């Protein structure tokens, strides 16, 4: 609880750091066959949390 005067974004990450890593990301992979041809689907939805 001490006020401190900084001057740039590089001064901030020295004393305070960065953001928090997100915990709500999911990745889905699906392999399919469509009349003998391969199809790959990648699905990353936007996180709700």
Applying CB under 8 A, the site for another protein has a residue count of: 3
Report if residue 37 touches another protein, rule: CB under 8 A: yes
> Facing residues of 15 across strands?
none
Candidates 3, 17, 24, 36; binder of another protein (CB under 8 A) is: 36
Report if residue 35 touches another protein, rule: CB under 8 A: yes
* Sign of CA pseudo-dihedral 12, 15, 18, 20: negative
Report the relative pairing of strands 37-43 and 28-34 from DSSP bridges.
antiparallel
Cβ atoms of 27 and 5 within 8 Å: the answer is no
Min CB(43)–another protein separation in Å = 25
Q: Which residues bind another protein (CB under 8 A)?
A: 35-37
């Amino acid at each position: 609880l001490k006020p401190k005067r900084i001057s740039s974004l590089l001064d901030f990450t020295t004393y305070y750091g960065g953001a928090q890593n997100e915990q709500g990301i999911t990745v889905k992979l699906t392999d399919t066959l469509i009349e003998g041809a391969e199809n790959r689907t990648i699905n990353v939805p936007e996180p709700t949390f």
